[PDB]
Amino acid sequence: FLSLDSPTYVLYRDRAEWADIDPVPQNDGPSPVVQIIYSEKFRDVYDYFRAVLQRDERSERAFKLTRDAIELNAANYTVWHFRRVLLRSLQKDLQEEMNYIIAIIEEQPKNYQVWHHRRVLVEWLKDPSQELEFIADILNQDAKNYHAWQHRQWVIQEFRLWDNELQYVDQLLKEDVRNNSVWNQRHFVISNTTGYSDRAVLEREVQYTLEMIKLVPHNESAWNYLKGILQDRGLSRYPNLLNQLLDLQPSHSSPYLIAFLVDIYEDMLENQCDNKEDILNKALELCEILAKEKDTIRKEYWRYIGRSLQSKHSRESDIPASV
Amino acid sequence: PVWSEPLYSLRPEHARERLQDDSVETVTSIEQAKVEEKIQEVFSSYKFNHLVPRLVLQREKHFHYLKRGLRQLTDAYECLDASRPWLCYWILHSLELLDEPIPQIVATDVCQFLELCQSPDGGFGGGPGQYPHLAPTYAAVNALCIIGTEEAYNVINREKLLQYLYSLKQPDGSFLMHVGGEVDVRSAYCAASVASLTNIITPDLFEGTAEWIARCQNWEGGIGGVPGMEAHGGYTFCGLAALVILKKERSLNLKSLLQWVTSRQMRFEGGFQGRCNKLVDGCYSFWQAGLLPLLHRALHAQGDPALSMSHWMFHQQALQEYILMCCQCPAGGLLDKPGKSRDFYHTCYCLSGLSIAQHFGSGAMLHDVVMGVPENVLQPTHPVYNIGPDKVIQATTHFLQKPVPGF
């Protein structure tokens, strides 16, 4: 019916079909705080919303009114709750409501309520068949939209729609290899399908990541993913990694490479490697280079790491005070 | 020396911190470059205008903006009509940081307004007649604790609050944000915060909750909104802070978390991003930098011998420079980044972040770093609740006088 932004929109207090209802003014008290000076349109819609909520009027007109209240303030979770009561109580067609939610999400994609509403609808319908394509359209406009990724994970997990997602991830990593949300989705997909314990998968992922690093050596996401997939087993578990990183030093260096080196050394020292002290001093040198020159924004962290390594891995570390 | 620049962001070496995009352009790098260029203009304005930089927190301007907002807001705030207790909290907390007293007339009006927001069955809603929700519940409790009078404390219906919390508790240890609502790590924080402040924590209220939060820590080291999701400063703050309240921080890999948050400070801008490869934003001056005091305490509780005894593990100076130079609106109020408009949310969290960056404290040890004029110094804030530590102690003491509902 009458769209909120229609040139011929009329206030509810001017609508004949609402004449029987007394609007309910907001109860702000005798001397209000944080009082919002609402526009006429806003206050008019919400005075009538208060009236139907108070009466618990479950009517077609109340249902239509919730659409306007939502458009005025899509964060009003009370309105969303009442709208869902009305959907069930009036037995509204839920695919029509899906059409509605897809339109509101397109216009207000960063709001929590709209995505929760869509989830409820999908649950009610037990139909995920529009979801991946819908989300992909939202992500085509904002490839890092957090709610969109969250809804995507929920849909994939709950309905077991794993088959095409790695392919989707690869497409987005091509568009922007710096998109951290996409590296996260890569991990989400692999974690839940093959796992990373499969040696051929892990090997494939590491080769892929190293290749991306070579293309874009200052892209922090690829670096965090390489570390993320290797670190639970322990970086020192992978003896070739160190030498291969050192080989990128010359013409692919970054504070990220240097920092990764320190992480490798730290784990080596943790698992009592050969040449304890040689490794320590290499690590301590890098910590100072990072703190003083290459990553000074993190000087306090790098000095803390240096002190930490010294404190527990120096030759004097286990030596009694009397010695 | 005379050639020496005391401001970190204005040193000649600082220019080497500009983005290196490896000649590979994507939307991410294009967007980051735009921000850096805008910020460089701010940093350079003194030199181009031939003035000596003076970093001044515009207290009087911020106070006027706040004092007015506490009473009345324009329709720019319609989108926050279901979040009015947040507005109370953001403004009162900003005023508290600026050491501006709360008139008793104001205090009582706030009390009465929040009473109107409180549901008959427990918790607070976004406004009078609205259903309760953990987010405005958290804000309302913080706001009343900032006021900290007998009247304020008495507003909170503790029995119903506890009943409300139980009604949201899920079998897997998580909490709904509200009835019929969504689950994410914010709810664990909101519930833990209000439950600990008001002494209503029962033996089983948070059963399974620490373990649920730990499942939200991901491969990055930070914490996502739900298990599987990308790490984000806001959710990471909620997760860690909630675990601190529950005394379960060790449920997390603290070392990968420490590495992740320190990496979120931007080498050029000085401020923090909310997640990897996104843009700096002044509100993360709290959500991200606020993690460092929490990590310090947790690590210290484990007897970590290598901890500094005078600084947090982030660049305190660079963060102050970002906030003071880039995040202040000349007319009063603070903001996300240059080009953005002021609002009460950023006013709260930019100042909260400034306070954190100014004040180090670990047991007996205390050390302040105040960039710019000494009048810049703010009151301290508690890194768990983000209200003054004095207000935290006073509230907990008062509510500990009462029995946990049900006994």
Ligand SMILES: Cn1cncc1CN(CCN(CC1CCN(C(=O)OC(C)(C)C)CC1)S(=O)(=O)c1ccccc1-c1cccc(CCC(=O)O)c1)c1ccc(C#N)cc1
């Ligand atoms: C662009 N931006 C940069 N910093 C803040 C923002 C926008 N945020 C909302 C911030 N929160 C988190 C995200 C930020 C980015 N997204 C966003 O920009 O969405 C729109 C605002 C365009 C719809 C998504 C939201 S937040 O409101 O979720 C939030 C942040 C910090 C503390 C609390 C909250 C919050 C608290 C209680 C309830 C909600 C309810 C919304 C809901 O859960 O349904 C949100 C905001 C919030 C309040 C004010 C004010 N005053 C100014 C800005």
Ligand SMILES: CC(C)=CCC/C(C)=C/CC/C(C)=C/COP(=O)(O)OP(=O)(O)O
């Ligand atoms: C207590 C409480 C309610 C805490 C919540 C704190 C908080 C900041 C949560 C943020 C959640 C979120 C959806 C971020 C994405 O916004 P975005 O992607 O548009 O912004 P970004 O680019 O900086 O991630």
Ligand SMILES: [Zn+2]
């Ligand atoms: Zn912000």
